[PDB]
């Protein structure tokens with residue numbers, strides 16, 4: 007048994023686990039070191055056009071340390087500026103993969119109640135970032151999935167549930183609670199008090215399989231759309247970090263190498279073995295992350311990974327350039343009078359083109375996890391985009407604009423103008439929210455004993471719109 | 478030293494080496510087992526349209542055993558039907574990578590003289606197929622490159638010459654004498670007797686590097702074209718089995734795994750080690766070809782290779798479908814009156830699109846040797862093809878044919894009709910040649926002692942146009 011066999015009071019606060027596991031706590035806290043904010047809309051402005059009419063056209067940055075998950079969820083312009091617990095653009099489900107307070111609340115109020123309401127609903131309750139309780143049982147310390155939607159997805163795909171999986175599989179599934187593609191399913195229900203409510207439930211689109219094409223069929227079958235494109239009015243699908251799905255198709259995944267083998271390598275100290283909990287870039291610790299299976303130089307492997315990134319970049323830029331042009335050309339055709347009937351096939355091509363390309367790039371490590379599938383997906387997406395553009399030339403010609411040249415979107419500024427994103431306004435409103443409601447959330451959480459001030463050290467130094475210097 | 482330190486009389490006939498190396502001779506001869514003829518124009522009819530106006534639109538089959546190299550060179554419709562040593566469509570250089578009689582003749586008459594004249598010139602001289610003398614010194618049995626153009630290419634690319642390379646490198650370079658991309662360089666010269674002659678010299682386009690793009694630049698710089706497309710009149714480039722070039726970019730190549738490690742695995746018998754000379758499909762001998770470096774199931778690796786093939790097929794069909802349509806749409810524009818000036822950019826896109834796609838598929842094992850580069854090349858080629866097609870819609874529109882639909886080429890028959898290939902005539906002429914001149918070649922070679930009748934057993938049972946049942 008463990009030294010906490012009766013459970014851990016205050017289990018949602020990872021600091022509470024330090025008295026039993028000081029080593030794991032120490033490395034876990036070190037993700038604070040990965041504080042880099044890479045503004046992806048600045049690096050890849052084409053993404054702004056792709057996501058026109060959707061929150062991702064406002065703010066979208068690369069992933070950084072777990073230490074910053076909760077704060078980034080609060081800082082992103084995507085969550086807007088709530089004035090109370092009933093305002094703001096996004097739902098309560100946006101906290102789901104950012105805090106150990108999520109399972110705490112689910113186990114307390116139930117899954118449906120948790121998924122009901124605005125994101126602002128739990129502002130002073132969900133205040134701890136990715137912690138021990140998100141992956142460990144507080145009595146046995148055993149690995150555990152804390153979110154019901156994962157097993158539901160696994161079963162739907164024909165996979166074994168978490169409890170039925172091997173230990174090596176669990177070493178990857180704990181990550182899959184969050185590092186997967188999902189969609190919010192509007193769900194009507196009624197509580198014990200007999201009140202009718204509507205919940206937005208996190209759902210893994212795996213009922214037809216976990217391949218990009220199978221998920222595509224899943225969404226088309228139910229005529230689902232995350233949003234109607236702001237420029238082309240195409241019924242769009244948003245892919246979100248399908249890290250596990252693509253990893254499973256990659257050779258490492260097929261060979262049984264778990265996420266943990268590279269991201270949480272072991273360190274042998276006598277008869278005791280420790281897992282590095284500083285989840286980050288495995289290339290910063292290759293001797294432990296790779297050299298236990300590969301026998302040559304470090305710089306060599308690094309170069310090979312770099313080669314993969316360059317190939318992915320090459321195809322990514324091509325695909326999103328044509329997807330961007332397709333959206334704009336469709337918008338132009340619309341302005342000229344093109345009918346929905348005349349644009350139906352084109353829009354279907356665009357929807358599929360972007361779904362495939364987004365699925366390929368949304369998982370930032372996919373270019374390495376499943377190199378070949380990523381390149382194939384980008385190639386497939388580009389082909390669908392070009393099929394749309396060939397048809398668009400003809401629609402444009404019918405309306406007398408065969409020589410139309412889609413505007414350029416090579417900078418975030420130019421792209422957001424095309425996407426009609428009033429950044430100044432969104433940032434201004436966001437800052438007001440951070441200076442008022444957010445501070446009230448943190449003050450109340452600290453007063454109630456749900457948040458330890460220590461966990462806030464340097465957590466809010468950066469965002470895509472401000473940099474106090476460094477987190 | 479060896480048991481033949483003074484050389485081997487009749488060295489060009491591999492049978493002569495059997496008295497010193499019976500084991501290697503026995504396995505070498507077993508490539509006779511790989512007698513399958515896969516008609517690639519039948520499997521991928523799009524290739525016919527791609528090669529319209531070029532010999533490859535007539536006959537092109539997949540590679541089979543070395544045992545059949547010389548006979549396939551004779552059987553292919555590409556070499557036509559010579560009536561004597563001064564007729565026939567192709568030059569003497571076509572024998573170069575098919576026989577050990579090539580180095581014999583080069584070492585005798587000189588490289589320039591060998592590369593001068595028609596293919597039919599050496600019909601009764603070059604009669605042995607890929608043999609010991611193509612890779613081994615007849616005194617030391619050491620590995621050796623017998624063709625001067627390889628070192629010239631290696632140096633031009635910044636590589637070490639064969640003699641300067643390590644043994645492990647030589648284990649791949651002996652294959653590179655033939656398994657590489659090349660072009661015939663028209664070369665004017667004058668023999669000792671003072672006669673002005675023109676030679677067609679095998680040249681490796683590596684002066685700018687061995688990547689597809691570097692070779693592309695090489696050809697564009699000299700305004701080179703293998704042929705003018707029969708349909709689009711585009712200045713085309715033909716890629717031919719760039720096996721070594723792509724292998725070098727693949728991970729196995731970067732890791733120092735030689736062609737021989739997979740295709741000529743070792744067998745340890747006491748203190749003696751033997752190399753399997755039955756060059757064929759490594760997957761038919763995985764325990765020896767792969768399991769000495771990989772630790773799990775055989776069916777597993779096979780499945781993974783199959784996965785790569787499927788991805789390659791997916792992108793290959795897309796790319797060549799758009800390349801085919803582009804050629805046809807250009808031809809249509811031409812019929813309508815489109816000028817060369819109006820079609821220049823389009824033709825440049827087509828040339829590059831096909832060069833990249835052909836380079837990706839011409840090496841039949843490339844999908845495995847360099848999986849990722851192959852997918853990237855097919856994606857790049859397709860993009861260039863689609864860029865051409867977008868521009869073509871506008872040219873067609875100008876001439877009143879915006880709704881033109883390029884004809885289908887889903888069967889070899891339909892494709893060859895579009896490419897205007899009179900197969901009946903070519904086959905009829907070929908058979909007449911085989912029944913007359915070819916037989917005279919073999920009879921004379923046997924009479925002169927250059928050919929051993931034993932080597933002809935079952936060598937001419939199949940071709941793409943006849944099958945006596947099995948070779």
Ligand code: HEM
Pocket residue numbers: 040068069070071072073074075076078102103104105136140141177180181182183184185265266269270285286287
């Ligand atoms: C499971 C052990 C697991 C792995 C592996 C993993 C990886 C991972 C990485 C490499 C990053 C980025 C690191 C960096 O320094 O850039 C990252 C980021 C986030 N993760 Fe994660 N992650 C694993 C597990 C979990 C779990 C269980 C959740 C959900 C509760 C989760 C969530 C996130 C979030 C959110 C981020 C973004 C952090 C930010 O940008 O602020 N991860 N993860």
Ligand code: HEM
Pocket residue numbers: 065066067068069078079082084085096099100101102103183184185186188208247368369370
């Ligand atoms: C709700 C729609 C929602 C919001 C809002 C949200 C935000 C968010 C941010 C700001 C990041 C950091 C990177 C960025 O700027 O985009 C981030 C990162 C990840 N998220 Fe998230 N997130 C929302 C919902 C969900 C859900 C429901 C899950 C889990 C199923 C999830 C998970 C993650 C993971 C993992 C990452 C890191 C990897 C990556 O590619 O970003 N998020 N999220």
Ligand code: HEM
Pocket residue numbers: 020023024027030031034136137138139140141142147149176177178180181266270279280281282283
């Ligand atoms: C939180 C700070 C936290 C603690 C504490 C903790 C402890 C812990 C222990 C004691 C082990 C076993 C010994 C070892 O170091 O291998 C262990 C192992 C793993 N953990 Fe953990 N862990 C904490 C947090 C997290 C988080 C946030 C995740 C999930 C994303 C997670 C995952 C894992 C994994 C996987 C292992 C390895 C299991 C194995 O190989 O046996 N831990 N952790």
Ligand code: HEM
Pocket residue numbers: 068069070178181182185249250253258259263264265266267268269287288289311369370371372374375
């Ligand atoms: C398992 C399903 C698994 C997860 C989860 C995971 C996540 C992850 C993320 C989120 C990234 C991107 C982080 C970022 O900030 O950009 C990422 C990147 C890499 N990973 Fe990973 N990873 C999983 C599995 C594996 C496995 C099994 C290995 C090792 C074989 C591995 C390695 C890496 C590497 C390398 C990167 C790229 C780092 C870089 O070049 O910047 N991951 N992973």
Ligand code: HEM
Pocket residue numbers: 257258261263267268288289292295296297298299300307308310311374377728770771772
């Ligand atoms: C560490 C982050 C790490 C790197 C880097 C790495 C690289 C690597 C490459 C480039 C390949 C080839 C496949 C591809 O094209 O991407 C490859 C293949 C295998 N690896 Fe690996 N690998 C890293 C880590 C690990 C770890 C921790 C293990 C061992 C548990 C591992 C294993 C393997 C296996 C197995 C393969 C498949 C090929 C084979 O040998 O069967 N890798 N890796």
Ligand code: HEM
Pocket residue numbers: 511539540541542543544545546547549573574575576607611612648651652653654655656736737740741756757758
């Ligand atoms: C070097 C050791 C070397 C390798 C490796 C190699 C491979 C190879 C394969 C796998 C085939 C096809 C086998 C099958 O059964 O399908 C094949 C075919 C041809 N090769 Fe080769 N080859 C190596 C070396 C050489 C050398 C030195 C030459 C040139 C003299 C050469 C040529 C050819 C030819 C021609 C064929 C086609 C045979 C036919 O289809 O009739 N190879 N090779």
Ligand code: HEM
Pocket residue numbers: 536537538539540549550553555556567570571572573574654655656657659679718839840841
């Ligand atoms: C000259 C233009 C020439 C001819 C003619 C020729 C023919 C030929 C045939 C018929 C095959 C079998 C496959 C098929 O039907 O296409 C074949 C195969 C290979 N060749 Fe060849 N070949 C000619 C020239 C050259 C030259 C100059 C080289 C070497 C530098 C060469 C090499 C090879 C190799 C290797 C193969 C097998 C691999 C493949 O993809 O076909 N050939 N050739």
Ligand code: HEM
Pocket residue numbers: 491494495498501502505607608609610611612613618620647648649651652737741750751752753754
């Ligand atoms: C022809 C029938 C032929 C003979 C005879 C022959 C002999 C031979 C010997 C004695 C060796 C060394 C011992 C061993 O089996 O490893 C050897 C090795 C290799 N050979 Fe060979 N060889 C014949 C033909 C060919 C041909 C046509 C090629 C080239 C395409 C070739 C290549 C090689 C290679 C490579 C080796 C391995 C060298 C090493 O690893 O030391 N041989 N051969």
Ligand code: HEM
Pocket residue numbers: 539540541649652653656720721724729730734735736737738739740758759760782840841842843845846
């Ligand atoms: C080295 C430069 C090298 C050569 C030469 C070579 C040739 C070769 C050919 C011509 C093919 C296609 C044969 C056909 O008839 O289709 C082919 C196919 C495979 N090869 Fe190979 N090969 C070279 C190198 C290597 C190395 C280093 C390995 C092993 C790591 C290897 C393996 C294979 C495999 C597997 C195939 C595909 C077989 C199939 O799926 O049909 N080759 N090679």
Ligand code: HEM
Pocket residue numbers: 257299300301728729732734738739759760763766767768769770771778779781782845848
């Ligand atoms: C045999 C023909 C053979 C097969 C099959 C095979 C497969 C294989 C795969 C699928 C990979 C991953 C890279 C990719 O995506 O293609 C891989 C990687 C490595 N291999 Fe291999 N391999 C075959 C043969 C051989 C032989 C004979 C050796 C050993 C000399 C070898 C070695 C390696 C190495 C090294 C890698 C790179 C990854 C790593 O472990 O560093 N393979 N192979």
Ligand SMILES: O=N[O-]
Pocket residue numbers: 246247
């Ligand atoms: O924005 N987290 O999918």
Ligand SMILES: O=N[O-]
Pocket residue numbers: 717718
């Ligand atoms: O047709 N041998 O390149």
Ligand SMILES: [Ca+2]
Pocket residue numbers: 187188189243244245246
């Ligand atoms: Ca989604």
Ligand SMILES: [Ca+2]
Pocket residue numbers: 658659660714715716717
């Ligand atoms: Ca060529």
Ligand SMILES: [Y+3]
Pocket residue numbers: 015022025
């Ligand atoms: Y406590």
Ligand SMILES: [Y+3]
Pocket residue numbers: 040068069070071
């Ligand atoms: Y990062």
